[PDB]
Swiss-Prot record:
UniProt comment concerning the protein's domains: The SH2 and SH3 domains are important for the intramolecular and intermolecular interactions that regulate catalytic activity, localization, and substrate recruitment.
Residues of the full protein shown: 145 to 249 of 536
Function according to Swiss-Prot or TrEMBL: Non-receptor protein tyrosine kinase which is activated following engagement of many different classes of cellular receptors including immune response receptors, integrins and other adhesion receptors, receptor protein tyrosine kinases, G protein-coupled receptors as well as cytokine receptors. Participates in signaling pathways that control a diverse spectrum of biological activities including gene transcription, immune response, cell adhesion, cell cycle progression, apoptosis, migration, and transformation.
Compartments it resides in: Cell membrane; Mitochondrion inner membrane; Nucleus; Cytoplasm, Cytoskeleton
Subunit structure: Part of a complex comprised of PTPRA, BCAR1, BCAR3 (via SH2 domain) and SRC; the formation of the complex is dependent on integrin mediated-tyrosine phosphorylation of PTPRA. Interacts with DDEF1/ASAP1; via the SH3 domain. Interacts with CCPG1. Identified in a complex containing FGFR4, NCAM1, CDH2, PLCG1, FRS2, SRC, SHC1, GAP43 and CTTN. Interacts with ERBB2, STAT1 and PNN. Interacts with DDR1, DDR2 and DAB2. Interacts with CDCP1, TGFB1I1 and TOM1L2. Interacts with the cytoplasmic domain of MUC1, phosphorylates it and increases binding of MUC1 with beta-catenin.
Protein name: Proto-oncogene tyrosine-protein kinase Src
Domain SH2, chain residue ranges per copy: 7-104
General remark: May be involved in blister formation in Pemphigus vulgaris, phosphorylated-SRC is abundant at blister sites but not in normally adherent tissue, which corresponds with loss and disruption of CDH1 in cells adjacent to blisters. Phosphorylated SRC is increasingly abundant at pre-lesional sites of blister formation and occurs prior to changes in abundance of CDH1 and DSG3.
Domain of life, source organism: Eukaryota
Membership in a protein family: Belongs to the protein kinase superfamily. Tyr protein kinase family. SRC subfamily.
Modified residues (Phosphotyrosine): Y43
Post-translational modification summary for this protein: The phosphorylated form is termed pp60c-src.
Tissues showing expression: Expressed ubiquitously. Expressed in the skin (at protein level). Platelets, neurons and osteoclasts express 5-fold to 200-fold higher levels than most other tissues.
Disease listed for this protein: SRC kinase activity has been shown to be increased in several tumor tissues and tumor cell lines such as colon carcinoma cells.
Amino acid sequence: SIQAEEWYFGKITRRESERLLLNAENPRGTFLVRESETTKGAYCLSVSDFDNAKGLNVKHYKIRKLDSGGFYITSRTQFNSLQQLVAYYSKHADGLCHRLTTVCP
Ligand SMILES: *C(=O)c1ccccc1OP(=O)(O)O
């Protein structure tokens, strides 16, 4: 049940997700999952990042869900549940700005 996950923030806006993530205390990979503002049936993974070029900044990735029942950011790497997707990206950075580390405070 996606709604029971502490990293699932539900229906909050993109601007709100940035307000929460742009905190100097958040290390790289601090994240949250929310509903997309514009895409019905898609979720959004918002992630904090930090580099000397840009300093602290936030990236947003669209998580698609198939009717067939699979979750993915890239169609080449699919998961049976959102929870499995989060667990996988907490170990592999792949194409993300950083691996997922901590749930947004
Ligand atoms: C995720 O839903 C998403 C992905 C990438 C950039 C922005 C974004 O958000 P909104 O879909 O809520 O605009």
